[PDB]
mmCIF file of C-alpha atoms and ligand atoms in Angstrom:
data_model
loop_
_atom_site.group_PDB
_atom_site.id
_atom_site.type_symbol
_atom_site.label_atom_id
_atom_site.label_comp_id
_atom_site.label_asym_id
_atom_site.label_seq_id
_atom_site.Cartn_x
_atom_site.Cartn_y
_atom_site.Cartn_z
ATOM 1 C CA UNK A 17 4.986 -5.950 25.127
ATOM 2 C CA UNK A 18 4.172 -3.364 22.227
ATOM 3 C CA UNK A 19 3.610 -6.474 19.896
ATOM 4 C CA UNK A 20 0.871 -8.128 22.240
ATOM 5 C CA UNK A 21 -0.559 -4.767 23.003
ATOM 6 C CA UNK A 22 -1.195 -3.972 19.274
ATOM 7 C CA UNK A 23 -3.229 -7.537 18.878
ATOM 8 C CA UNK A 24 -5.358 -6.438 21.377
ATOM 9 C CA UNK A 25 -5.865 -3.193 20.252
ATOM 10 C CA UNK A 26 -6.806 -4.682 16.431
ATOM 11 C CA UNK A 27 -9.469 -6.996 17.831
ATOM 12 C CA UNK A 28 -11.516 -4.915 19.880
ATOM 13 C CA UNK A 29 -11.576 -2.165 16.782
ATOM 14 C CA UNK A 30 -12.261 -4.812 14.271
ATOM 15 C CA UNK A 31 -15.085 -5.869 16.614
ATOM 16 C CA UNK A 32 -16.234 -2.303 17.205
ATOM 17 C CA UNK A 33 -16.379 -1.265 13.957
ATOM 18 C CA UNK A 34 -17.037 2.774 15.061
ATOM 19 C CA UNK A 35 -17.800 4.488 11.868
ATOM 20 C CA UNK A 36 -17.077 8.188 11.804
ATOM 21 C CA UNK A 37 -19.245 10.987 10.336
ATOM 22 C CA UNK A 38 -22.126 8.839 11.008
ATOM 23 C CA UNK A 39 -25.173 9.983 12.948
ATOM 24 C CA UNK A 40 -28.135 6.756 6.548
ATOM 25 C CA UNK A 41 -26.981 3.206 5.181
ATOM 26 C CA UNK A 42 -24.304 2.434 2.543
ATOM 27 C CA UNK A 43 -25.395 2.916 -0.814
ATOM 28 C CA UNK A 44 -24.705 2.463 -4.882
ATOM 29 C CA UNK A 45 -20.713 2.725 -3.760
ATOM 30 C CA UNK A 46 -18.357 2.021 -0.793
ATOM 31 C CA UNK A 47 -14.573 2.567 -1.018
ATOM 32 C CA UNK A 48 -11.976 0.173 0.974
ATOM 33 C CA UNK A 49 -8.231 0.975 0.712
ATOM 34 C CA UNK A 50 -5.542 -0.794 1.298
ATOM 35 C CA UNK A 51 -3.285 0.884 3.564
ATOM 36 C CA UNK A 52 0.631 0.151 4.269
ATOM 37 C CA UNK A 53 3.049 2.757 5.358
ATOM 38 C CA UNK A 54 3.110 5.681 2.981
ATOM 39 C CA UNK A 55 1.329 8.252 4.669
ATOM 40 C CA UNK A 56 3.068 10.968 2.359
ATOM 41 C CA UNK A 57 0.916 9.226 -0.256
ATOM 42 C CA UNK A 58 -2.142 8.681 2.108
ATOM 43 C CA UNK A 59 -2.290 12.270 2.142
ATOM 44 C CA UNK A 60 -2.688 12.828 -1.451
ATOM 45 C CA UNK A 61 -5.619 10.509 -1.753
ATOM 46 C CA UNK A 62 -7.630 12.137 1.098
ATOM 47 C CA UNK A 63 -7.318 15.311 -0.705
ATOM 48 C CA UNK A 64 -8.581 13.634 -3.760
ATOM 49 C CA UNK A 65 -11.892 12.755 -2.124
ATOM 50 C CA UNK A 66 -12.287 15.910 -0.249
ATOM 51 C CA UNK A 67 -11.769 17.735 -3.923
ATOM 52 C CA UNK A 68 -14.667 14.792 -5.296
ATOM 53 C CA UNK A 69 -18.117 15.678 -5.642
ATOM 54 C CA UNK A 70 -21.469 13.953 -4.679
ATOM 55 C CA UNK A 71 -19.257 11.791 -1.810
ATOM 56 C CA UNK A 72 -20.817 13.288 1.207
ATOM 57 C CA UNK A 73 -22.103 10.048 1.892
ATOM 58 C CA UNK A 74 -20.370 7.314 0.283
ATOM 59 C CA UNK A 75 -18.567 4.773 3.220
ATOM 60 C CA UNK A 76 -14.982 4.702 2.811
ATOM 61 C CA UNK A 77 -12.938 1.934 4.794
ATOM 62 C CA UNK A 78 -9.408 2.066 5.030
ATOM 63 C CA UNK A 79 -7.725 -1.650 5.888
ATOM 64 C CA UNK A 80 -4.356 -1.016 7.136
ATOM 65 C CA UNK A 81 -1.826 -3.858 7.903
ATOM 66 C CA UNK A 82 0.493 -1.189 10.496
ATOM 67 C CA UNK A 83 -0.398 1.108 13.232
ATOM 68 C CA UNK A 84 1.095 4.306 13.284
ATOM 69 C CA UNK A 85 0.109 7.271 14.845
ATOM 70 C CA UNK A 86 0.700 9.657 11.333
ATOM 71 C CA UNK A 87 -1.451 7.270 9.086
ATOM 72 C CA UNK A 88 -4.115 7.364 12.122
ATOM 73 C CA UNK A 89 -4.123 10.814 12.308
ATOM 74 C CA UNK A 90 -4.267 11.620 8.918
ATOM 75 C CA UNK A 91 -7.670 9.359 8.589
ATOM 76 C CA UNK A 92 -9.072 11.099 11.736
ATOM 77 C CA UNK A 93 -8.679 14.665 10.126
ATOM 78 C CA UNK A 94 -11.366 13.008 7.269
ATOM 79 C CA UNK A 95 -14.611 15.003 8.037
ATOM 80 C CA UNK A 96 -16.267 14.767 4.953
ATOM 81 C CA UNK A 97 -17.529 11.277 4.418
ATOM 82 C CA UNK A 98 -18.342 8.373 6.323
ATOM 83 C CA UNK A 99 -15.185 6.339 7.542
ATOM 84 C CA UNK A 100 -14.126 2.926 8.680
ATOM 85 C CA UNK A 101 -10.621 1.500 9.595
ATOM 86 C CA UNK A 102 -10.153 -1.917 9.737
ATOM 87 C CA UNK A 103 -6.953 -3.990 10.494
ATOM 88 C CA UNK A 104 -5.519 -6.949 8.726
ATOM 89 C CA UNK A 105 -4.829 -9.402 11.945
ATOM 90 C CA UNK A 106 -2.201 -11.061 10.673
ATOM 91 C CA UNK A 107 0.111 -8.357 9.713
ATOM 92 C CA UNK A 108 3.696 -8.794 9.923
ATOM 93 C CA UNK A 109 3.341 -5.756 12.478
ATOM 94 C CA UNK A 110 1.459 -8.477 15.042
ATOM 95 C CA UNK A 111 3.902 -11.517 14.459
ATOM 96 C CA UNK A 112 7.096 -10.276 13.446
ATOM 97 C CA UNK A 113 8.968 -13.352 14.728
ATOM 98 C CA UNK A 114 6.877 -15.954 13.734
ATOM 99 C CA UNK A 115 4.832 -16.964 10.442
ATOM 100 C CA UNK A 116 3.040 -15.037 8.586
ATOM 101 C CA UNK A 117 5.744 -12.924 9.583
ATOM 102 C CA UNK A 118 9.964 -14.280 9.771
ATOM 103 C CA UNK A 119 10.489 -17.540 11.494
ATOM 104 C CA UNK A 120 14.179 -17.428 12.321
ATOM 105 C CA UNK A 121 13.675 -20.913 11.201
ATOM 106 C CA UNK A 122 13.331 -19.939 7.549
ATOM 107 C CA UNK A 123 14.975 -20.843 4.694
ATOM 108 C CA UNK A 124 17.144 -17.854 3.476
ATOM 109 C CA UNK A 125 14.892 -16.350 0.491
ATOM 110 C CA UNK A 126 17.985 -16.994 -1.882
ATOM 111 C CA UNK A 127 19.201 -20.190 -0.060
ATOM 112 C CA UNK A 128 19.279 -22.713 -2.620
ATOM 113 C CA UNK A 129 16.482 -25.554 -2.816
ATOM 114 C CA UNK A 130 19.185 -28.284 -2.776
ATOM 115 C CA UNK A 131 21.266 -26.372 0.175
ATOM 116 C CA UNK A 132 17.618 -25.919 1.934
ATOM 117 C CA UNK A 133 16.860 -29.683 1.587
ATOM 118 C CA UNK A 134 20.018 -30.551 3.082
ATOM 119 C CA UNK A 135 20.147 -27.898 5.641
ATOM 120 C CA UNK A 136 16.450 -28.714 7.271
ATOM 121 C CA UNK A 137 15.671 -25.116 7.061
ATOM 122 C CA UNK A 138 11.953 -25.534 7.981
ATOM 123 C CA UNK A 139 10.257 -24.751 4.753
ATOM 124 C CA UNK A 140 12.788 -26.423 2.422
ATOM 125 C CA UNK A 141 10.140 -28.522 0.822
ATOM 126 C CA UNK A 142 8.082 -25.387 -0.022
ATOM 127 C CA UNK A 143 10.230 -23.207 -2.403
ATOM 128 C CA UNK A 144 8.148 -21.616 -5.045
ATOM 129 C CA UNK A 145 8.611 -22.393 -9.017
ATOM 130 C CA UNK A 146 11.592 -20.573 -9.358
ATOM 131 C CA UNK A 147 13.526 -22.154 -6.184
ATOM 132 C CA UNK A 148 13.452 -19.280 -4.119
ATOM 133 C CA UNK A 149 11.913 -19.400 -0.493
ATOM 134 C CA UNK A 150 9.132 -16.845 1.023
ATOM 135 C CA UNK A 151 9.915 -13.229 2.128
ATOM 136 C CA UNK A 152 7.357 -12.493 4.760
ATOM 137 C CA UNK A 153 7.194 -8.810 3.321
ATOM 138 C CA UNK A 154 6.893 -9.752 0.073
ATOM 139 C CA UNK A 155 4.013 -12.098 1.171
ATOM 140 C CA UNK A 156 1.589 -9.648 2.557
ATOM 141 C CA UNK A 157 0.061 -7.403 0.289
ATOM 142 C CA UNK A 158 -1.533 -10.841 -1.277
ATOM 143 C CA UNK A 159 -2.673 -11.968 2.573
ATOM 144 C CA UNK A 160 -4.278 -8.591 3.075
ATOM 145 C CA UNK A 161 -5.600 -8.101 -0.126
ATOM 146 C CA UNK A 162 -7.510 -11.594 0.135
ATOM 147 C CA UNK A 163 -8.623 -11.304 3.632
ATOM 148 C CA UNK A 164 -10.070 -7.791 3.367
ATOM 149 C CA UNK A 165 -12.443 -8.495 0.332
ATOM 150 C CA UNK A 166 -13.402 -11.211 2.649
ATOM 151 C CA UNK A 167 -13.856 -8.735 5.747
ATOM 152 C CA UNK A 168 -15.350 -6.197 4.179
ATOM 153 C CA UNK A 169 -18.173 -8.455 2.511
ATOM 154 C CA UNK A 170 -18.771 -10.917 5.363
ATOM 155 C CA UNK A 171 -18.106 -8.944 8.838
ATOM 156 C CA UNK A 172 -18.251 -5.494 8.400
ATOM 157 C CA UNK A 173 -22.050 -5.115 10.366
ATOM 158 C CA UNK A 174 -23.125 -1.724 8.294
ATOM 159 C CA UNK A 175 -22.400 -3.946 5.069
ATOM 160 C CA UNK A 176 -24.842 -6.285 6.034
ATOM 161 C CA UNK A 177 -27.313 -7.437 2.831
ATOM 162 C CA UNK A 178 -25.615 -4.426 1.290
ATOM 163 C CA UNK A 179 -26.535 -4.431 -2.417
ATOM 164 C CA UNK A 180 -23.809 -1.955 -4.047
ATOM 165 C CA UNK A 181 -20.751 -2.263 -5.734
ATOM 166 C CA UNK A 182 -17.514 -2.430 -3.348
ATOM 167 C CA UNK A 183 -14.437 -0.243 -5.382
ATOM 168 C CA UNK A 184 -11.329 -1.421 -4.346
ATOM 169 C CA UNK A 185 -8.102 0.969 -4.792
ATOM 170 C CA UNK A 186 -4.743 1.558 -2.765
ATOM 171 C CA UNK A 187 -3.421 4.530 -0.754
ATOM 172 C CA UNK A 188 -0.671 5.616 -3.589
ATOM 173 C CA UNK A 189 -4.262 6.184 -6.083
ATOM 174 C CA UNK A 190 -5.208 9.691 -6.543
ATOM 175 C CA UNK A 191 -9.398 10.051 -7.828
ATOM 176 C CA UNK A 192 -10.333 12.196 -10.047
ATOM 177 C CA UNK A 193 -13.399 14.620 -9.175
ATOM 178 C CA UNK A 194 -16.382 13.571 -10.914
ATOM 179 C CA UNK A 195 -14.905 9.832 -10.433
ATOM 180 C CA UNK A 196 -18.312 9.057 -8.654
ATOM 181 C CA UNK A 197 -20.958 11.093 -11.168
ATOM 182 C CA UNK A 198 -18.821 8.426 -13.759
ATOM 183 C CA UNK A 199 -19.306 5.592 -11.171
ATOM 184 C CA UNK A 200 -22.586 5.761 -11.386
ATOM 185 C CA UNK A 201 -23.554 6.234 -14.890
ATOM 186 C CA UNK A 202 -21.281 3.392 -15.455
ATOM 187 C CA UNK A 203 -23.205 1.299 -13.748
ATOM 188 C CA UNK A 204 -26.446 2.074 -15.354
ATOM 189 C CA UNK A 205 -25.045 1.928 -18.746
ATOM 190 C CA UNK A 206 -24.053 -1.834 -17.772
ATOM 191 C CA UNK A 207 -27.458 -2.591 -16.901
ATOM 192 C CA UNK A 208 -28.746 -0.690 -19.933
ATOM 193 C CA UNK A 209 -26.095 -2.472 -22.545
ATOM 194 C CA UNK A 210 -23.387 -5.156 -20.862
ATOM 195 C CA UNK A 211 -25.442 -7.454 -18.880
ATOM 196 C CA UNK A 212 -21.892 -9.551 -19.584
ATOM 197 C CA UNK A 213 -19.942 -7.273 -18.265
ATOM 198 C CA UNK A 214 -18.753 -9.027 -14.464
ATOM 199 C CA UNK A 215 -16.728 -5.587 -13.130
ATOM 200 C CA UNK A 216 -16.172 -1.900 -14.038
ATOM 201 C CA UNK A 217 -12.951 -0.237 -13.475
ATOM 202 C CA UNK A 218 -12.413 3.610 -12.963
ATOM 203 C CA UNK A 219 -9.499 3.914 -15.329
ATOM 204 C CA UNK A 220 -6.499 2.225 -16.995
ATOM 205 C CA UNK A 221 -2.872 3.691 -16.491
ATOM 206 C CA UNK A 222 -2.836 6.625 -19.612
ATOM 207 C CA UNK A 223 -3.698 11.559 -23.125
ATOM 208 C CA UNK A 224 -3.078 15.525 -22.563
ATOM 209 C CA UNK A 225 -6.025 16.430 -23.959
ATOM 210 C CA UNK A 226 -9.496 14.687 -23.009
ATOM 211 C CA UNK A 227 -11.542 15.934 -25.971
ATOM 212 C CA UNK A 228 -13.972 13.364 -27.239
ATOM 213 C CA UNK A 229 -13.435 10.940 -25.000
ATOM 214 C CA UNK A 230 -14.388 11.719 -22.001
ATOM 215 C CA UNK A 231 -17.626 10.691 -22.408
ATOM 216 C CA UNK A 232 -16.394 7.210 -23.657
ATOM 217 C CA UNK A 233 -16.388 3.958 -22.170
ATOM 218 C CA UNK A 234 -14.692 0.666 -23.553
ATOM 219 C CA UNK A 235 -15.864 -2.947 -22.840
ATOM 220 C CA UNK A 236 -12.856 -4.700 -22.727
ATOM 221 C CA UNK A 237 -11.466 -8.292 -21.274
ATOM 222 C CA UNK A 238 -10.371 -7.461 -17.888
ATOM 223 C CA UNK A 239 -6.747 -7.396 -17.791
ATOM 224 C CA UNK A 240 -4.114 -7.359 -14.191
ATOM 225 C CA UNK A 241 -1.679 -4.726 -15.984
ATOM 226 C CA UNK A 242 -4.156 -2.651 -17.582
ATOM 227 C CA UNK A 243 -6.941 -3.060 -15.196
ATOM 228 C CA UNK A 244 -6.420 -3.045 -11.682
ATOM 229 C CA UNK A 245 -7.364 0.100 -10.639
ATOM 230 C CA UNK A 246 -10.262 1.289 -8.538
ATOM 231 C CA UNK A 247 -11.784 -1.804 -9.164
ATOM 232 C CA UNK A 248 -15.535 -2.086 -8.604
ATOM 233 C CA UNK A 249 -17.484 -5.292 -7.645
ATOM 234 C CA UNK A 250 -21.043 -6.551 -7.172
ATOM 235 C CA UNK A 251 -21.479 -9.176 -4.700
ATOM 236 C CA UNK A 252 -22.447 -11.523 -7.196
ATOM 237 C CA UNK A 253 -18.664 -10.526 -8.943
ATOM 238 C CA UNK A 254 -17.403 -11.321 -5.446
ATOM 239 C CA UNK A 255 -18.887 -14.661 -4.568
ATOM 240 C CA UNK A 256 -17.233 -15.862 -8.041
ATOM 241 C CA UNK A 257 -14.205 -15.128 -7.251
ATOM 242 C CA UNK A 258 -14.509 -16.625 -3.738
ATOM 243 C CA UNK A 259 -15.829 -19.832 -5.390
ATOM 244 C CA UNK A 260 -11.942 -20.230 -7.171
ATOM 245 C CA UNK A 261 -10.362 -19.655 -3.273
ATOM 246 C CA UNK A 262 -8.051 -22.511 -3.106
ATOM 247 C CA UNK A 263 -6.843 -21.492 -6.796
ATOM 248 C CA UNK A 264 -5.796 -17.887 -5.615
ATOM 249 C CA UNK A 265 -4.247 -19.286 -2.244
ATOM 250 C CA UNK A 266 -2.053 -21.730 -4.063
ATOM 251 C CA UNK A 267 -1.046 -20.033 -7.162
ATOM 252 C CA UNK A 268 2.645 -19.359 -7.018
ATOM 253 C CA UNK A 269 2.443 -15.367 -7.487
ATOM 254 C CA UNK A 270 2.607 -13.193 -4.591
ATOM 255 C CA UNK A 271 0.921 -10.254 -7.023
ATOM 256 C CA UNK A 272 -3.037 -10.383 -5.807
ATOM 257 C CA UNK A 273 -3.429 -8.613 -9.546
ATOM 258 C CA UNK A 274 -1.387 -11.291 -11.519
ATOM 259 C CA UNK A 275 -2.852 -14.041 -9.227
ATOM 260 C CA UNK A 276 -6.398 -12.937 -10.532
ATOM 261 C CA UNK A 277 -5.261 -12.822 -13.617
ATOM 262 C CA UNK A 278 -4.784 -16.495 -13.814
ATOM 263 C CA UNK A 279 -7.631 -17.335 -12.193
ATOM 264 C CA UNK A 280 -9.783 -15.473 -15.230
ATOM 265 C CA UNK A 281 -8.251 -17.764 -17.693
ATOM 266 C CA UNK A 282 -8.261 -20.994 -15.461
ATOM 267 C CA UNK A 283 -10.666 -20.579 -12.748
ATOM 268 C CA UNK A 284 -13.602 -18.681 -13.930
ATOM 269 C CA UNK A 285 -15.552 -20.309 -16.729
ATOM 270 C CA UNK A 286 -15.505 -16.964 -18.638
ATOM 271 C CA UNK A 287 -12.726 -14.355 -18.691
ATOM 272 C CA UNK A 288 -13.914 -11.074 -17.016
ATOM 273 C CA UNK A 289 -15.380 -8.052 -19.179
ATOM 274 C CA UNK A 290 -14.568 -5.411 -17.609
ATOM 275 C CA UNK A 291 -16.342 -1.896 -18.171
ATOM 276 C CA UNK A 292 -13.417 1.332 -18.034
ATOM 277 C CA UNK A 293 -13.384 4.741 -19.402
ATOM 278 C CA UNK A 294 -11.349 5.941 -22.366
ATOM 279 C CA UNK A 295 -10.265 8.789 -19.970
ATOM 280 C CA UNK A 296 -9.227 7.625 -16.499
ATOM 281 C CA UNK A 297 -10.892 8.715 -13.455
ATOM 282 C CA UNK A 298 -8.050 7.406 -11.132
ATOM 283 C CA UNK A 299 -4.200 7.695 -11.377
ATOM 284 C CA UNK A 300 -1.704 6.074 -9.722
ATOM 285 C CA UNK A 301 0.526 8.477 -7.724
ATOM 286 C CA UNK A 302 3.263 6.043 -6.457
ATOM 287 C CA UNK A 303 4.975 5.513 -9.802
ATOM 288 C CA UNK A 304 7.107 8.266 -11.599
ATOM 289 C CA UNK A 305 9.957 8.794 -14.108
ATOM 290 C CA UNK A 306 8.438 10.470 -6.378
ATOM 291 C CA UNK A 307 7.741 13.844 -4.779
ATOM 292 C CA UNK A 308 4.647 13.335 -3.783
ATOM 293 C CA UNK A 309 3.972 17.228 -3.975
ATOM 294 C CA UNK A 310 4.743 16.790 -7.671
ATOM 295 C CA UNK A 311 2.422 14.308 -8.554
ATOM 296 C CA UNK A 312 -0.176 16.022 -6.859
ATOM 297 C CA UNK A 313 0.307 19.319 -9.220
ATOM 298 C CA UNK A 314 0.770 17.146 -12.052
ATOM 299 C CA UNK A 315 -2.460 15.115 -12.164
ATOM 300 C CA UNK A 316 -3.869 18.904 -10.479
ATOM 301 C CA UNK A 317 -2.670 20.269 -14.100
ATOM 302 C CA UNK A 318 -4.135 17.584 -16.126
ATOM 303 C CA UNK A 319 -7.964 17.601 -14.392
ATOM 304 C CA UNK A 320 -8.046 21.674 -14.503
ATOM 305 C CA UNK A 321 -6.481 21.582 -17.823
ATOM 306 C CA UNK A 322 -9.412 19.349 -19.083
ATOM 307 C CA UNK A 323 -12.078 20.658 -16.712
ATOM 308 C CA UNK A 324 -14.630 21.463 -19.531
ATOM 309 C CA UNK A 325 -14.452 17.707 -20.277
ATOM 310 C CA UNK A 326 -15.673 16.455 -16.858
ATOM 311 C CA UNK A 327 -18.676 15.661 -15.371
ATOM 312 C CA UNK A 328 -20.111 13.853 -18.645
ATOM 313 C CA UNK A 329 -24.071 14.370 -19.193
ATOM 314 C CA UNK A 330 -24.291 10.690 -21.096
ATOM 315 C CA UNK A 331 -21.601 7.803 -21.410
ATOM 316 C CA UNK A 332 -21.895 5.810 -24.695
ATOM 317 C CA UNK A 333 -19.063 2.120 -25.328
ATOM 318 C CA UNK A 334 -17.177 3.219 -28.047
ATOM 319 C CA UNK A 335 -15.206 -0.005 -28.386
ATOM 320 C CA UNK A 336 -15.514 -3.515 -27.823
ATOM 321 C CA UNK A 337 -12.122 -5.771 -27.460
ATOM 322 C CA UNK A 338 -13.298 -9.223 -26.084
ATOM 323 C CA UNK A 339 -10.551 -11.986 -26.252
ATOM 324 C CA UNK A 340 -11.637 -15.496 -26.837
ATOM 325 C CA UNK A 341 -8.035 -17.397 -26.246
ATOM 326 C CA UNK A 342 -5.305 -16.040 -24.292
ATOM 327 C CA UNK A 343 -2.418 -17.680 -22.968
ATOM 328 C CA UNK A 344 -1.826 -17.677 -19.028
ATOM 329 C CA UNK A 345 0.494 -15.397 -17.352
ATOM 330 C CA UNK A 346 4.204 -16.890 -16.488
ATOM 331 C CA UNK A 347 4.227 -16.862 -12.563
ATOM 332 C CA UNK A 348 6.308 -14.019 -10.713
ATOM 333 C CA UNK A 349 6.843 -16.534 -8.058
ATOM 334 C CA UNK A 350 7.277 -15.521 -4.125
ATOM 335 C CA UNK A 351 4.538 -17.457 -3.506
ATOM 336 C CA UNK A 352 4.876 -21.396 -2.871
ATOM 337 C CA UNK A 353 5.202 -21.935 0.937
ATOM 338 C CA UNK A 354 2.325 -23.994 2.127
ATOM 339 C CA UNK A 355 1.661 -21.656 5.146
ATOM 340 C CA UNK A 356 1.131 -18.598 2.911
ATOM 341 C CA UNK A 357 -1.055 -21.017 1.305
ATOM 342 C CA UNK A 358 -3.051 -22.455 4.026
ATOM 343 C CA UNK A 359 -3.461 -18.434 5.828
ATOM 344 C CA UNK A 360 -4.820 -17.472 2.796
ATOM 345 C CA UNK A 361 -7.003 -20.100 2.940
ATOM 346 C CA UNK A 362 -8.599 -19.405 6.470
ATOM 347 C CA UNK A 363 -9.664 -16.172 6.505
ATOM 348 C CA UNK A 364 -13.371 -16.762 5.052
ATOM 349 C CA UNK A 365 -12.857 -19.945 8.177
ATOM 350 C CA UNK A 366 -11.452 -18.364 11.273
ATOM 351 C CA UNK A 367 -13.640 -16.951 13.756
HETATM 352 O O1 UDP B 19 3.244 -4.693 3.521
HETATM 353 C C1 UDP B 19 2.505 -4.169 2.661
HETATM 354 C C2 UDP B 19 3.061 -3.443 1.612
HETATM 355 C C3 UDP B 19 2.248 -2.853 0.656
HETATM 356 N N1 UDP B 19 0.917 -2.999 0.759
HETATM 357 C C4 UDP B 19 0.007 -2.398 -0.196
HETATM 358 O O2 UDP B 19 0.248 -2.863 -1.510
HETATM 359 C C5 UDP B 19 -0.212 -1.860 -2.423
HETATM 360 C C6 UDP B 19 0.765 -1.718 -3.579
HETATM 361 O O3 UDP B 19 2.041 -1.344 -3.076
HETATM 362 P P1 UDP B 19 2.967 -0.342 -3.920
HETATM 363 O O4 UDP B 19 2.107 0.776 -4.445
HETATM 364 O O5 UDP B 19 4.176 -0.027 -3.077
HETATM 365 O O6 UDP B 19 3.427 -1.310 -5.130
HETATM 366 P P2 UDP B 19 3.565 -0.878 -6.679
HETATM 367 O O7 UDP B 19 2.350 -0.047 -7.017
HETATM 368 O O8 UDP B 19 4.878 -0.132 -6.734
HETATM 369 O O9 UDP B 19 3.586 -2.219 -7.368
HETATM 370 C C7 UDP B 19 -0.340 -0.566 -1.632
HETATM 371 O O10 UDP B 19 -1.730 -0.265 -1.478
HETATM 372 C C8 UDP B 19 0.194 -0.897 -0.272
HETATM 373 O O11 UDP B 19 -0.570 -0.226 0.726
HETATM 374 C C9 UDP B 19 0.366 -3.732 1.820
HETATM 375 O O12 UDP B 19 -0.868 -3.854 1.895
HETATM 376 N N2 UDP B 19 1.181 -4.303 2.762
HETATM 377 MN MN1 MN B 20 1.769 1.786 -6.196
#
């Protein structure tokens, strides 16, 4: 059995934890991306961080919720920086016939909540706000997303007492190349002037020219739409949001993004700040109108076009936008069944 064989094969690497490139300790940065099945896009991120400077030694894990041989491959050809992969364990890959993947004893996802309740459907009493019923699918991005900020911080062994910031981005993200010189004078401009800043993100989703402000840096209230891009975290960021768990679990939004969104305004007894350049140092390559080919020569066009811009000598905030009432975001739904719910509550238990 293929499916039993892969569970196997995830817990003895999760356990293992080999980490290429490695004869050093994490520092300042790591990198963990979640991985799906794109490896078209996959590809165009590696060659973003083999075109990045200063990375030689900067731990990147990749936390991928299906095996395949191509997106395995494609990490293995990474010789340039340490690497980790890590596997979500409760992928729909693993359990494809049961929860978290599709019971055949499901409610349709369009069945509706009065048919369900009649029918006995097994999660009739569970439809989310807008009477629809789960898609396993459409759950999983939000289970893996959870449980690898969990894995990452908790059991990966070479991230033991580590004291950096964590960046968090997604295999359709493309970096620009001085993305980690910005990193890091990011950071030391929010130690130098926004102690109240909680997170830093490498860029929001838009210029053709970078003149002027590429050197700039805004302190802003974090934001899902805007902000949830190569987002960086301290531990301290991490164990805040950790301490609003059963308020992410049971929020009826399947979007991880949209889900912390709410839990700023509800949850968390202030809103984020969130530190971000004026210019972005990440783009998002899945999104067009995609070839990936073209997207790589675009975003290749823009960072050439603006080389003389990069690399910054000194970052300076040149605005300040802090929000002091805001109403909470209307729920996108997908997201009411109790199990989805109670998985997403485990992972920090299990083990
Ligand atoms: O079953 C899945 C499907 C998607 N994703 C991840 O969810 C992220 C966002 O997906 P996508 O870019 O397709 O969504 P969009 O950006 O179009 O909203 C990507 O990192 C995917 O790797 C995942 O972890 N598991
Ligand atoms: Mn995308």
């Amino acid at each position: 059995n293929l499916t039993l064989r892969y569970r196997s094969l995830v817990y003895q690497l999760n356990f293992d934890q080999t980490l290429r490139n490695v004869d050093w300790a994490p520092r300042e940065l790591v990198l963990v991306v979640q991985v799906h099945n794109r490896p078209e896009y996959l590809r165009l991120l590696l060659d973003s961080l083999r075109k990045a400077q200063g990375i030689d030694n900067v731990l990147v894990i990749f936390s991928h919720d299906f095996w395949s041989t191509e997106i395995n491959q494609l990490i293995a050809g990474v010789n340039f920086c340490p690497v980790l992969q890590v596997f979500f364990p409760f992928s729909i890959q693993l359990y494809p016939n049961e929860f978290p993947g599709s019971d055949p004893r499901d409610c349709p996802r369009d069945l509706p909540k009065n048919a369900a309740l009649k029918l006995g459907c097994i999660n009739a009493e569970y439809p989310d706000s807008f009477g629809h019923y789960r898609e396993a699918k459409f759950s999983q991005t939000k289970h893996h997303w959870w449980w690898k900020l969990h894995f990452v911080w908790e059991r990966v062994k070479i991230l033991r007492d580590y004291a950096g910031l964590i960046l968090f981005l997604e295999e359709d993200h493309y970096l620009a190349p001085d993305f980690y010189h910005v990193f890091k004078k990011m950071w030391k401009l929010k130690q130098q002037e926004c102690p109240e800043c909680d997170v830093l993100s490498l860029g929001t989703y838009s210029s053709r020219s970078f003149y002027g402000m590429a050197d700039k840096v805004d302190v802003k209230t974090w934001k899902s739409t805007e902000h949830n891009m190569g987002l960086a975290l301290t531990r301290n960021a991490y164990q805040k949001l950790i301490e609003c768990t059963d308020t992410f679990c049971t929020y009826d939004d399947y979007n991880w993004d949209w889900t912390l969104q709410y839990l700023t305004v509800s949850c968390l007894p202030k809103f984020w700040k969130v530190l971000v350049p004026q210019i972005p140092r990440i783009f998002h390559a899945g999104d067009c109108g995609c070839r990936p080919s073209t997207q790589s020569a675009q975003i290749e066009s823009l960072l050439n076009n603006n080389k003389q811009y990069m690399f910054p000598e000194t970052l300076t905030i040149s605005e300040k936008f802090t929000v002091v009432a805001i109403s909470p975001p209307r729920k996108n739904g997908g997201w009411g069944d109790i199990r989805d719910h109670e998985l997403c509550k485990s992972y920090r238990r299990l083990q």
